[PDB]
Design a protein around this ligand. Sequence first.
Ligand code: HEM
Length: 280
Amino acid sequence: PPAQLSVHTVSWNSGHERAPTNLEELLGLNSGETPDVIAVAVQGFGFQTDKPQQGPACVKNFQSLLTSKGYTKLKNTITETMGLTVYCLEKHLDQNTLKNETIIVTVDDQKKSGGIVTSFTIYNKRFSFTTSRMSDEDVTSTNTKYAYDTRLDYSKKDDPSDFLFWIGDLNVRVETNATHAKSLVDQNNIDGLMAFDQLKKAKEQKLFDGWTEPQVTFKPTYKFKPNTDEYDLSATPSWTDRALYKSGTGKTIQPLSYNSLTNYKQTEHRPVLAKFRVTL
Ligand code: HEM
């Protein structure tokens, strides 16, 4: 059983947009890396019903690229507003010990907000992947708009997972006006603008407790005029898709990279790719 493993995560608030064509870039495979685990999270509208009938393409295209690479799909879970998919190199799996499990948490009577958690064990180490979705107007267990619920947090289990990732649009925004935010973006003062981001506020309120975000060096990933690099300044530019990590058991999780994928411009938000190396 190996000393270390690699994990790629991508999330995208993709809205009504269909999965793209070039998936290699999306999953961070385009420079020949072969991560041990890949998780893909989306937030948007109408995945479950699938009225555009786009389900069949995703499967076809994702399964085509990933199977030839040695990946097994551990689980795809979709709701009306969220999607989470977890892949693992076939070579790591032992059916007797994997304990592959997913819960869905739902906070409203329309089941539009909440989250999804997918967990599995390899080499007697337990991974958990969460995505979540909250609306600004929602009444909530935290009485905030942030997409946290303690049920989705497997570091607050009696037996906390070894490696935990939370990916998606956490409904955390930049709390200042658009003029000032756009000035900071133009100056490339990413840390200056992050000073106004709400993740720290969420944490002062004991949400995402002990969860770390890798250092952010990219400009806000929202809100863009589609197919441009131009901010739509009807909203204050913000970091919407995020990746957070923790360990419940003192295991080292080292971010290698954390980047928006500005090549994917087809919508208002840009997908975010994180790569980690975890020590078992
Ligand atoms: C960038 C946007 C999207 C991404 C990245 C994405 C990603 C994924 C992934 C990774 C899977 C699992 C593929 C596999 O089987 O290995 C999946 C499945 C699926 N997607 Fe999406 N998706 C997107 C948009 C949508 C949209 C707009 C819809 C329709 C409302 C949709 C409907 C579905 C359905 C129905 C499945 C599962 C179908 C089945 O299991 O038979 N997706 N998607």
